[PDB]
Amino acid sequence: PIEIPAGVTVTVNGNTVTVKGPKGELTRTFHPDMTITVEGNVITVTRPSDEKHHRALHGTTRSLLANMVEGVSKGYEKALELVGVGYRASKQGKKLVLSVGYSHPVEIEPEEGLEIEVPSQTKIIVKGADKQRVGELAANIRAVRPPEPYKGKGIRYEGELVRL
Amino acid sequence: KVRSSVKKMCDNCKVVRRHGRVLVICSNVKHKQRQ
Amino acid sequence: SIKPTRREYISGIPGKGIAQFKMGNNTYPAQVENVVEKPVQIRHNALEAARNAANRFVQNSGKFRIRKFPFHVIREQDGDGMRAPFGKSVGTAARSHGANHDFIAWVNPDPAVEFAWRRAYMKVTPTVNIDSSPAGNA
Amino acid sequence: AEFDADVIVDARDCIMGRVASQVAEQALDGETVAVVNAERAVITGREEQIVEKYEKRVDIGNDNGYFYPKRPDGIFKRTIRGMLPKKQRGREAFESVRVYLGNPYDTLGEISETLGA
Amino acid sequence: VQGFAGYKAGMTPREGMETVPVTVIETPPMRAVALRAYEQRPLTEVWTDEFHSELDRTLSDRLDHALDIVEDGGEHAMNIFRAGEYADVAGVTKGKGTQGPVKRWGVQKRKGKHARQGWRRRIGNLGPWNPSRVRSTVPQQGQTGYHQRTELNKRLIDIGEGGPYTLVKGSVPGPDKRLVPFFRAVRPNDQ
């Protein structure tokens, strides 16, 4: 059960749904073994199961679709901490230059859709037209440049913790 | 861990299902329950 | 279901050396309890242990009355090889008759005990059934 | 290349079981079948273990031999022969049963693909 | 003909800076012979005679530049192989024959109290009782001398034309001189 905000263009067919609007031009997949509720202003959970099982199925589709939404409307931004007294990172080329010892630093690229931002050398983030892929590659780096909690330092998903 | 006889620890250690598999997840390494 | 020689003749009339029948406490209502449903020459020692085990985990009220007792005996190896069997004796046990009134945890309201027997339970040897008697337990 | 039209057959979505079975019965009676589709026909869910069994075919490789086709082509081949008899009649029948990739003439892609498409 | 080839001159080594051995190889440009291509239907090899004068006594890079000189009109000098690079080369064995478990294959034979005792060479055994009969394992006396042999990382250093000839690093060309050796350069690690 959800609405379909401004410019929310929702094409339901094949079993995919092209979903286009602002800094959100998207086209996603939405199962053919259940049922679609799309209606000019809002949208919702059909019930081609009505039973606990596929139940989960479309509660999920609720969230998903929702995604096509908020997404295609106002994109996605994941807040990344670069905490490294020594470890440091900044934009360079059309990619991210991060440095964490080892020797070589790394150029990471956010292919079509993925965009990385170096607000300020110490904190870094990722905005991508969509939560899925975003959070995804995002963490990709977030583990990629070790977060070893031995005693602090590492890339870390915003707001974490210490140790001993 | 023990592979056989997984049974919750921290007062919130989770019985989760991965591959018909009962492994338990908690927020302390001190739990890693894996059958 | 083979058994002992003559209870005054092979090995007959002991004291099955064990650890008696009542620990735990009183009460008029709540029957809290242990019974089983397997069939076997219940393992003297084993049992004895198990049981006192429970005792161990607890100490007082909650009828740890225990309705079992090993009174006959097993035998094997002592003499020439494998053919003609004279008779070495070991294993005093009792026929757990496929389910029955085992040991109780009887009392008004003391779940501490209930759990305890539980303990004694996991303990024991042949699966056994965890239970309540005539009213429930409280 | 091209041929008759005796047994004009194709698959897809089918139950890859009695499909062969008939494949057979016709083969058997004595009817040369030409059929295409591999990929699009089907076989028991639990996709995973499905693939399983079939690579069973895949690496079941012992010194003496034990190939096991890696394309749909085979999948079927094996099944079918699986329904025939090695003696002559069986044999030749086998010559007489012929199917292909998709279309060279007027779940059944997944495990052969997986283990050797 | 996809590749580059010729024969066994001889080995010796001399010079350099420390001193390295090598072998010389024979080959001007043993002419064009069609040109590999599964095009339009099956296309694999043709022979619009342009041949020897004897040969009716018997009657995409590599191959592509091979299109270059092949079209040229037959032959195509060898030495694309330049200033030390790595071909690799095949050479037919050297007919050693049918032999003993020994050199056919390294194996200790007749220890001593009996290494001798009018007793020697003959592999020791075949197969556990109960497993059953005979593997396809343990070689046997497995002839050697006609195998088609060859190797990797074949570093060639230099060449010259006083006749089309090459000097390659570490002979091991397999067979003996006056013999058939082929060289490519493939999957180089010491690329």
Add this chain to the structure above:
RNA sequence: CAAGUCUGGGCUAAGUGGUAAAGGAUGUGGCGCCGCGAAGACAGCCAGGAGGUUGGCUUAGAAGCAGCCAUCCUUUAAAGAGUGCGUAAUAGCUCACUGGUCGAGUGGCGCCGCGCCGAAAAUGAUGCGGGGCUUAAGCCCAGCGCCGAAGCUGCGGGUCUG
């Protein structure tokens, strides 16, 4: 390889079927209980996260958050004999307590029928094989007809005993 990819009503989604025990675990599917949603209910969220409680052995530190013994009182929104992360005891969070928002079904234990971990193996693999996942088929209960012995009848002949 002869005969219903019969039809009927359940349950399986692990190839279980094509061997295993104790023991696991809001898996799934069917049956009984305690507490409420208009003292408008469990997880969300706001919040005070009450005071005499900091009581005894050991204290050197129990003063819930060393362990052995208690488990009362309370002014007042109740109470928390404060199960809980710690530290040298103390010193913060957590619900065992509920307003508004919600707002309509939530948390429980027994009884079950079906199923996954436990359940490592030696020339090579295995439902017999090819095979199959709501007639697949398996597994349960339903009716159905067809298969199949030299066994029983037709067909005809042999034979001994009365």
Add this chain to the structure above:
RNA sequence: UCGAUGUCGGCUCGUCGCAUCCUGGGGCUGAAGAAGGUCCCAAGGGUUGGGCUGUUCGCCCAUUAAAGCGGCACGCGAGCU
């Protein structure tokens, strides 16, 4: 199996297998490092000379990354010993 299957140890040739010694990949520590320990996944390849002992095994010598368990009639006598 007694109208018969030749029982040790060694030899030579080996071939599985995993409960993996060494390897790699893991999660865990009372893990900082480093090196250790706990177990899960994996058998690729690899897994030394003496010494004394008919011995296997074993004890000791010097190495090593290692110096693995066990199957195959405790594999091998129509192959020795």
Add this chain to the structure above:
RNA sequence: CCGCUGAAAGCAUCUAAGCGGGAAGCCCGCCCCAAGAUGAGGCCUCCCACGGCGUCAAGCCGGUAAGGACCCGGGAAGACC
């Protein structure tokens, strides 16, 4: 073994469905055979319809050096072949 994305549990969950992270391992890659893989594979080069007999004469004769073969002469090719 570790994540993202997210149901069913309007609050979590790597998670049945969706996507990736990751092994001296598996498949491929390297090299060595190899269509007698009876499913005899490709390609090029070259030789042209001899004879006379009953026929679906797919049976008997010169043949084409298309070619090859025998014998001889020689090979790290090698028991013979």
